[PDB]
Ligand binder design. Structure first.
Ligand SMILES: [Cu+2]
Ligand SMILES: [Cu+2]
Ligand SMILES: [Cu+2]
Ligand SMILES: [Cu+2]
Ligand SMILES: [Cu+2]
Ligand SMILES: [Cu+2]
Lengths: 328, 332, 328
């Protein structure tokens, strides 16, 4: 039966951007083919040069956002090059069975595996590595991402009416626990293996040293600031595979928000801030109405402005004095 | 106000069972309102909470952590005979989040060793609720010592989905999540005590760090694994009641979902569908309904993976049945 | 156009109390004029006499609750007396544009500014100071409050029927991070700026030393306890500008709760406890049915009974034997 379904290949895109797709499906179910290569690599996470041994899906933190439609089949070819040193796998929160696929995609360096699962539930979901006995270590090393399963007829508001976005961004929020020496400075490591002991110790404090968007402090600012224009409808998919977060668009709102990201549920309206539980992906739809710079943040202002969970939006267009204006 | 004659209502006694199991009950009420009689005996006792053998001075309702799940229907009356045997050393009481008045019953149930009391309250609101000890000035100490449980007030007509249609579970489990703050010494080793009291100062200090040393299901690391793993079969509808009386948690069925979830657990509200993960606020009980479609081992966890796989907030499901290659399969 | 609207000047009142207002709008859109004076001052936050250099809106923590109706224009005159030492501004989560107003309300000591914005979305929202580069420091120093934007036809239940409260209280929850020394004792400073470094270090631990209602431990207890009577309908607006909280009325419930505080959404019913994410304001409606003392708390019992997040309600009326009683 699966053999009768036509197949389509997707070229993934590095976050915060998302690979193109049709919001409203133009055909019946399909088998969507994806391919990701696991890559263990050093990564600089803050402005002081602190670097870690990151574990990534396709070389980025977070991994790329995968997009399909409800009832399509997701077929992922997962590759683990012999240049890596650890065993990895992948767990799809969108999938049903075998620990989300974790127990079927274990691959040591030099191996690859292909997993297929039916996307039976619409919504944005988290996907992350989960090696038996070393789950949080891999996840907090940046090995997580998300997949969006759109309703075949696109998104809908709290009244069944269509909600169409002009652009979509994927913000992966990452909590890091960089080990510190007795002096209070970040220790150095040659391999992911040597850091395990200290990694476990750092994680058990439950106090992140960093909390960043797209892999590093200020990653989504400057030339990498998100963009929009007055009148533009923007969907922002936000995930946190291990810890709670509370997204907030400073100067705006989440007009329609699926805090826990499942589309069969009507969205919450006019959110100033929403809670995305650790191990969940959420989605917020907003129509810009004012130009200028906006800050998108985890509203625990310490986590945002001190630990790194903050990015920017640069919006073009005409200022609306009716909505807001400085009185002189 | 004209009194309501309660003496006319039929009475039924309930024999509580230890978690994660639940005492006998009917989803769809087979009778009209009843005065449901429960009896719990407070028991202060030593308890091993991890594989290394760490032992604490636990404060329990009926000898278990969490306390047993009580089940009644909307508008029944809950009558609890609370006993504090003279073998205990501390003052205790009980606060039902399901009750209205006297601090949930806390102001009417203070009992010292050797005393007992009987409380009755009308379960006017359907949902799963937390119940916990709450002695003035020592509330968090008793609660984080394991003295909390949960009560489920089923709608008289059973559970319903977002469309008002019946949702019937084949089995139910109660997972009580506990955050422990075991004090350690200057060296970093868990300190030991002969009496619950003597450790108060240290307990307060350990708690105020807001950093749990252990976060476990059913009283201890691995309590719901191995021979004590939860079970189900493909096609089975399972309801998992999960409570956390003091700290937030984010349940997740690894390999499954929360088909219908009442994150904050109140049934007059439609459930959230297809949840991958949900947030149950500290001081709240939530419920998740799921229909298994794949056999095999599943992990039920607090999705802060550190709290789950390092601190202990993880349990297992062993499911029987035929594998579905359509839902998921490895490609050759 | 805006010039054709009636203008009304409001006299703000100290929390937990709220200035007089009508729930169902008595007129059409108006320009509601408010005035707040920024005040840097010392504040004792606990029973041990611990004092901090608080940054307040109108001299209190939290700042006062502002009340308007959906589509009214909020016009705020923010005054920064030359007796203060820092620059301040204000960000309204209810406003659209310029970082909620922060980018247009920067005022040094000796300056003032007037901001106007249209309250286009109904619900309770957080407002707080947000100076670039010093956001969490000002917010956790107590510089935050809330504004309620009532639907023009008042509050409604899950079935669209009217919900009218007899009284309303505003509980502002504040997380403080008082720096300590070697000995572990709270340090004191001559000026707020002098302690910037210690404050940053204290905040970065993500562990509050105090979590209080209305500025201090026990602020809403004793003769300052909240009051009600059996049969009374009470709305409790609760905000937390920087950290999550989980309100709970001990002995009662949240009959109708807008956890994330936006009225276009139906309220959640019969809540025992609800989660208000940091950077959000929530509202709970309850009809008291039993007299006596009630405790209103953040239900992380440690934060409530050890750190200070607990208040009291003293309720009058006759006891209801049917709802509860102590048996023979
Ligand atoms: Cu991995
Ligand atoms: Cu997961
Ligand atoms: Cu007790
Ligand atoms: Cu409680
Ligand atoms: Cu300020
Ligand atoms: Cu803000």
């Amino acid at each position: 039966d699966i053999s009768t379904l036509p197949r389509v290949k997707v070229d993934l895109v590095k976050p915060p951007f998302v690979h193109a797709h049709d919001q409203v499906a133009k055909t019946g179910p399909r088998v969507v083919e994806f391919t990701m290569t696991i890559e263990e690599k050093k990564l600089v996470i803050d402005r002081e040069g602190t670097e870690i041994h990151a574990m990534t899906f396709n070389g980025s933190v977070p991994g790329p956002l995968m997009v399909v439609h409800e009832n399509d089949y997701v077929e992922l070819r997962l590759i683990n090059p012999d240049t890596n040193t650890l065993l990895h796998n992948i767990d799809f929160h969108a999938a049903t069975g075998a620990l989300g696929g974790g127990a079927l995609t274990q691959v040591n360096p030099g191996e690859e595996t292909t997993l297929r699962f039916k996307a039976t539930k619409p919504g944005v979901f988290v996907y992350h590595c989960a090696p038996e006995g070393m789950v949080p270590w891999h996840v907090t090393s940046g090995m997580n991402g998300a997949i969006m399963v759109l309703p075949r007829d696109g998104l809908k508001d709290e009244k069944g009416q269509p909600l169409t976005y002009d652009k979509i961004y994927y913000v992966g929020e990452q909590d890091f626990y960089v080990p510190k020496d007795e002096a209070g400075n970040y220790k150095k490591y040659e391999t992911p293996g040597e850091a395990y002991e200290d990694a476990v110790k750092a994680m058990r404090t439950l106090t992140p040293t960093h909390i960043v968007f797209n892999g590093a402090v200020g990653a989504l600012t400057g030339d990498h600031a998100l963009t929009a224009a007055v009148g533009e409808r923007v969907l922002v998919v936000h995930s946190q595979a291990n810890r709670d977060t509370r997204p907030h668009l400073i100067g705006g709102h989440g007009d329609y928000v699926w805090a826990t990201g499942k589309f069969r549920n009507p969205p919450d309206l006019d959110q100033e801030t929403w809670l995305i539980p650790g191990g969940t992906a959420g989605a917020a739809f907003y129509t810009f109405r004012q130009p200028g710079v906006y800050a998108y943040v985890n509203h625990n202002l310490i986590e945002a402005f001190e630990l790194g969970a903050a990015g920017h939006f640069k919006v073009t267009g005409e200022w609306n004095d009716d909505l807001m204006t400085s009185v002189v």
